[PDB]
Structure 1
């Protein structure tokens, strides 16, 4: 060891982390990308053949961004002319290749600027969204049937989400839900008519003489929200001569009383769909279960079959109510909910019965239900060794809940403590992905006896490269505050000597249900800072953090900018009493919510921190969107929570920034946390006479993610941190 991990190493990607990304096409087979080829693999034996040759489209004319192949395997969708919108949304051009015939389809094509495309879950049908309307193609070469006729840019969204629903509710652009066998197409309709618009400048290339104004319907805290309708259409009875009939399912009586959200769509059977609705005051949700009536041609949701989920101490769900996992007959389901002790566990419900029974228990949490069979439910949790930041796959025997097996705990306990899973179509095989503390490990197993078939990727090419680099280590541990554990992690410089005093950087996020202390191996900015600059990079999960029960998570209910801020400062006080930290050189940085907390910490007047960087920070809660903000804060009204909205601004703390060195950074085309947020911080610092450092990034959004911008921001921050710490 003598080379360190450099800023260039991080920025130019010298040391690459190998993945093994598959998509199960069946229960037996999966698709992989070899050396630009598309390979098909046999799960059983590991043999492969070329499913699609690299050069098949070298006369396509267009650069292909993605492929999507139909469930029956007869057709493939080629996606090109990719244009990013928000976090999930984009537009693209699409071509359909006939696999059997080996030919591009030239007639009745998917138009340009298509917003969303999806194959039916079986067969080869298509639903697409274009100019905010839904279209369906039974056959890839036949005409499309126009489902909806009301789509209007920035106003009516059919089968696609609007800004807030995309970002905060569904984490997707899509709002189309096919029934399991493709008969029914379910969809949501959003109406943004009175949602105010966020406006900002877009400068574009220098050839653009006059800046453009981007206008986006975006509800900020307490503003008028989008309204939602829900429909189902029968695709097995579409007409070429008459318009399609869409049957509306109306929200429950309990939701229609005021503003509400559609928060979940899950198909139970071929003729049964579950819908969860959330009140605008996000402590009351309702699951409706709706059946198709063959004689009516309609959908009825019995009031007797509703399921209420609520919270006394907070909002419902981690970020939203959890999704149901129905048994094959759709008469019962499993769902994560917080128990009596405020820990999130799997409850078993009967469609008819208000009471569920908990099938897991304890002072740990189920992260997600991964797969359900007739015999087993498969889930991820942080149970192993009481470490909320570890992740393992368990299987619970359905006929007796005390038979729980850990399927990943013991495989490589040293290098592997953080797992996610990908099961085949009918859970016959599963791929395990371990993300640390060692280099990521990808393995294939059969569900039959949970035997390991093979290692898919071991990252040995990376391991050999790392040998000669002076790499940092990671300590993950806990401190005790008021008789409660709070977990922290430290990225420690190479040859860490306890007798030395190192500068410390506190890497903060600290948003509700966050987790910044975990067993994951990462190569990032912090890796460079520890390896090259000998800075300790620390993270702490205090009050408000997730995966440790409601008492911790709900600690910040209605009170953002309080306990989660105070706990970062207290953690730094604790780190400085650990002996190896130079009290004179403690810094803090964060992005977005992290930017908010950083700013709040630096404006606290605590004296702990010399300097800090806030990137794309929230500055006050009325500036941020309604569904995220109101979840934690309620409404900004005298009759609700206005006083805390007013009291939790970074602007209010300006005067205390005289004690610290601040860098403020923001993208000018941030649609998420608007540039407005930084512009108000800087104005307030100016108004009280504090000097600080700033950087706007022209035309960059929340990610600040352009190759050049990405390199530029990290270079700028490194110089700042190095100057703060007196590092040449």
Structure 2
């Protein structure tokens, strides 16, 4: 083939994967944009028609960033002037556009600088957030109603998350939840008043004479947390003369006695809300079931029917308490629980009764509950073949739990072993999405007979190109250690000779519930390293990794920077055993948590590694945020777990670094893992007399993802790996 997958190919996207992103607009149609025209498709028969023509906005004036369409298709939301803040948050300008007419709404427009916007679940109501305040417009051309007046920048958040919550709790900027009706609007309020600030320089354009200091409320492990309230407003009864009345649903009392989080919000029915709360020590959580009393207007949450969750071995849930999927009638739900043997399975709860019933079981885990109908529940799991890094779609029959059919396993077993799914409203149809090991494959299906209806995107175009190129293969297998199977992967150079010896790169994340050994097809830096530079690129899922049961996942509880670290080192040793690695040229690298584990590995004097790269690492767990850190570490107090906070820093290993080449890299505007963390790493290395290489990226945040920086760091890191391995 002559040609390899080059650094420039990765950097420049020479070889692109086609996807198939559709948005279901009912039980049987969906939107999909062809070129830049928006099509609507009939699912059963496959015929499509143009829904919105690209030309419709050539005269709009602004470049449009995204669009959202109302449940009843009368209107369409156009998002422009998009300015990204954190990992999910951003502000933007908005226009709505009437579709029955071909006219753009000019009266009572949504404000510039809006922080969040969302239609009601049905109809064409709008709720948005602006200046930390919540507004509702019944009609798109009608004046809005102000629902809160408390909003204050960096202090009072109504209907949106502060930093920790967006990042660690809801994975979203949003904190609004319409009732299925579109009648109630629930929302959360966060109070950050006494939360300390992280302050760093942002240097901006050369033209800026003095650097700006950014100040964000950010609780580090042990520090004062934001506080939260929850409210529900009756949308229907919005007066033009009266301020609007928000009803408060206070947390359980088992929560109110100390710090706690609102971690899940789920409308069960028109008049039933489920709220899940989490104590600040995250081994204990409470689910409340709240019903609207039409007479009193209140929302009552009978103590009797709270559902309680505890862990003896760790925290609750994989990253947080699992979500409840309610049956249509609202009198019961399913939800992923860790069972008697510490494997996560689907439990079935009935609203006013004790315990729950496990409908699945086995030495493997359900990954997520995906859909629910009267006959069937649909979930993704890693049952098939006992590969914890595989995913398939299953359904179990509700009237007889022993009838579990697999919907995706045998579809095309050499190519697809990792699916996700998207169900149309009411689950009449699903799109399967296979991610590997072969090229991505998007197909439709109908629920009745689970017939495959058609192929949506088979990525044929990509395939014909890579036939020309010299691509690495991927080995998924496992080693045994004490008596546990531990899964790894190698990305192997083209024309692999196990009689030859290759430099190896241990690519680590290895953070809690991580999994770096899977069946996913990727085109990335590693592909480059293997194809062009003939470097093997390994990942190993050691203790602390996920999707294999609490025994392994919890092995690291309160004890970060130990077994997950030890195990990476041990894997490198197994990898040397296998006689196709150059035991002399082993390297290691990670981003984020991977940077922390990498640094610790390099500071353990193991002797196994020659050099490694750490990007935006944690260095000391008191520096990272409360919600994430305390989950595994508890509090940094003498009475809790300060001893291991102090004892699990990178800085304290600095002396050992003189036995390796180390490259340390961090963005200065990193709002997540603060430049501070590496600012301390280098000082400790300096103070002890160890030479090391370094690179800062000015104004880049945690993702060091701007196009120029992203090309620059992988170019810089590629040089560092080449030199280490003596590669031409």
Q: What TM-score range do you get, normalising by the shorter chain?
A: over 0.9
CA shift, 1:35, in A, is: 1.1
CA shift, 1:623, in A, is: 0.1
Q: How does 1:150-161 map to 2 (within 5 A)?
A: 150-161=150-161
User: For 1:552-576, what per-residue CA distance to the aligned partner results, in whole angstroms no more than 9, with x for missing partners?
Assistant: 0000000000000000000000000
Q: Paired residue for 2:586?
A: 586
Q: Paired residue for 1:107?
A: 107
Is 1:246 matched with 2:259? no
Whole-Å separation in 2 of the counterparts to 1:403 and 1:2: 51
User: For 1:314-359, what per-residue CA distance to the aligned partner results, in whole angstroms no more than 9, with x for missing partners?
Assistant: 0001000000001001101100010000000000001111210100
Q: Paired residue for 2:258?
A: 258
CA shift, 1:403, in A, is: 0.5
Whole-Å separation in 2 of the counterparts to 1:446 and 1:435: 21
Whole-Å separation in 2 of the counterparts to 1:349 and 1:452: 33
CA shift, 1:468, in A, is: 1.1
User: For 1:94-138, what per-residue CA distance to the aligned partner results, in whole angstroms no more than 9, with x for missing partners?
Assistant: 000000011000000100000000000010000000000000000
User: For 1:669-699, what per-residue CA distance to the aligned partner results, in whole angstroms no more than 9, with x for missing partners?
Assistant: 0000000000000000000011111110000
Whole-Å separation in 1 of the counterparts to 2:79 and 2:390: 37
Whole-Å separation in 2 of the counterparts to 1:58 and 1:205: 31
Whole-Å separation in 2 of the counterparts to 1:205 and 1:58: 31
CA shift, 1:289, in A, is: 0.3
Query: 1:198 aligns to what SS in structure 2?
Result: strand
Whole-Å separation in 2 of the counterparts to 1:309 and 1:345: 15
Whole-Å separation in 2 of the counterparts to 1:32 and 1:420: 18
Whole-Å separation in 1 of the counterparts to 2:303 and 2:90: 38
Q: Paired residue for 2:619?
A: 619
User: For 1:58-116, what per-residue CA distance to the aligned partner results, in whole angstroms no more than 9, with x for missing partners?
Assistant: 11000000000000110000000000000000000000000001100000010000000
Is 1:538 matched with 2:533? no
Whole-Å separation in 2 of the counterparts to 1:362 and 1:422: 25
Whole-Å separation in 1 of the counterparts to 2:320 and 2:248: 24
Query: 1:477 aligns to what SS in structure 2?
Result: strand
Query: 1:598 aligns to what SS in structure 2?
Result: helix
User: For 1:176-222, what per-residue CA distance to the aligned partner results, in whole angstroms no more than 9, with x for missing partners?
Assistant: 00000100000000000000000000000101110000000000000
Query: 2:601 aligns to what SS in structure 1?
Result: helix
TM-score using structure 2 length: 1.00
Whole-Å separation in 1 of the counterparts to 2:644 and 2:479: 29
User: For 1:630-672, what per-residue CA distance to the aligned partner results, in whole angstroms no more than 9, with x for missing partners?
Assistant: 0000000000000100000000000000000000000000000
Whole-Å separation in 1 of the counterparts to 2:85 and 2:602: 34
Whole-Å separation in 2 of the counterparts to 1:682 and 1:54: 52
Query: 1:114 aligns to what SS in structure 2?
Result: coil
Whole-Å separation in 2 of the counterparts to 1:624 and 1:10: 31
CA shift, 1:145, in A, is: 0.1
User: For 1:399-433, what per-residue CA distance to the aligned partner results, in whole angstroms no more than 9, with x for missing partners?
Assistant: 00000000000000000000000000110010000
524-533 vs 353-362, which moves further: 353-362
Whole-Å separation in 1 of the counterparts to 2:696 and 2:42: 51
Whole-Å separation in 1 of the counterparts to 2:514 and 2:221: 21
Whole-Å separation in 1 of the counterparts to 2:156 and 2:47: 49
User: For 1:154-195, what per-residue CA distance to the aligned partner results, in whole angstroms no more than 9, with x for missing partners?
Assistant: 000000000000000000000000000100000000000000
Query: 2:629 aligns to what SS in structure 1?
Result: helix
Whole-Å separation in 1 of the counterparts to 2:104 and 2:468: 50
Aligned residue-pair number: 728
Query: 1:236 aligns to what SS in structure 2?
Result: coil
Whole-Å separation in 1 of the counterparts to 2:668 and 2:634: 28
Whole-Å separation in 1 of the counterparts to 2:102 and 2:693: 59
Aligned residues: CA RMSD = 0.4
578-587 vs 42-51, which moves further: 42-51
Whole-Å separation in 2 of the counterparts to 1:468 and 1:332: 55
Whole-Å separation in 2 of the counterparts to 1:46 and 1:695: 53
Q: How does 1:702-717 map to 2 (within 5 A)?
A: 702-717=702-717
CA shift, 1:11, in A, is: 0.3
Whole-Å separation in 1 of the counterparts to 2:634 and 2:547: 23
User: For 1:487-545, what per-residue CA distance to the aligned partner results, in whole angstroms no more than 9, with x for missing partners?
Assistant: 00000000000000000000000000000000000000000000000000000000000
Whole-Å separation in 1 of the counterparts to 2:355 and 2:143: 49
Query: 1:195 aligns to what SS in structure 2?
Result: coil
Whole-Å separation in 2 of the counterparts to 1:55 and 1:8: 35
Whole-Å separation in 2 of the counterparts to 1:510 and 1:300: 43
Gaps of 5+ in 1: none
Q: Paired residue for 1:651?
A: 651
Query: 2:164 aligns to what SS in structure 1?
Result: helix
Whole-Å separation in 2 of the counterparts to 1:28 and 1:398: 23
Whole-Å separation in 1 of the counterparts to 2:199 and 2:317: 32
Query: 1:426 aligns to what SS in structure 2?
Result: helix
Whole-Å separation in 2 of the counterparts to 1:354 and 1:311: 18
Query: 1:76 aligns to what SS in structure 2?
Result: strand
CA shift, 1:36, in A, is: 1.1
CA shift, 1:41, in A, is: 0.9
Query: 1:288 aligns to what SS in structure 2?
Result: strand
User: For 1:301-323, what per-residue CA distance to the aligned partner results, in whole angstroms no more than 9, with x for missing partners?
Assistant: 01111000110000001000000
CA shift, 1:606, in A, is: 0.0
CA shift, 1:2, in A, is: 1.4
Query: 1:544 aligns to what SS in structure 2?
Result: coil
182-191 vs 348-357, which moves further: 348-357
CA shift, 1:619, in A, is: 0.4
User: For 1:350-407, what per-residue CA distance to the aligned partner results, in whole angstroms no more than 9, with x for missing partners?
Assistant: 1111210100001000000000011100000000000000000000100000000000
Moved over 3 A (4+): none
CA shift, 1:48, in A, is: 1.3
Whole-Å separation in 1 of the counterparts to 2:507 and 2:411: 31
CA shift, 1:584, in A, is: 0.5
Whole-Å separation in 2 of the counterparts to 1:487 and 1:336: 24
CA shift, 1:140, in A, is: 0.1
Gaps of 5+ in 2: none
46-55 vs 167-176, which moves further: 46-55
Whole-Å separation in 1 of the counterparts to 2:601 and 2:152: 44
Whole-Å separation in 1 of the counterparts to 2:458 and 2:268: 38
Whole-Å separation in 2 of the counterparts to 1:667 and 1:607: 29
Whole-Å separation in 2 of the counterparts to 1:529 and 1:38: 39
CA shift, 1:46, in A, is: 1.4
CA shift, 1:55, in A, is: 1.1
Q: Paired residue for 1:320?
A: 320
TM-score using structure 1 length: 1.00
User: For 1:599-653, what per-residue CA distance to the aligned partner results, in whole angstroms no more than 9, with x for missing partners?
Assistant: 0000000000000000000000000000000000000000000010000000000
Q: How does 1:468-617 map to 2 (within 5 A)?
A: 468-617=468-617
Whole-Å separation in 2 of the counterparts to 1:95 and 1:84: 18
Query: 1:355 aligns to what SS in structure 2?
Result: coil
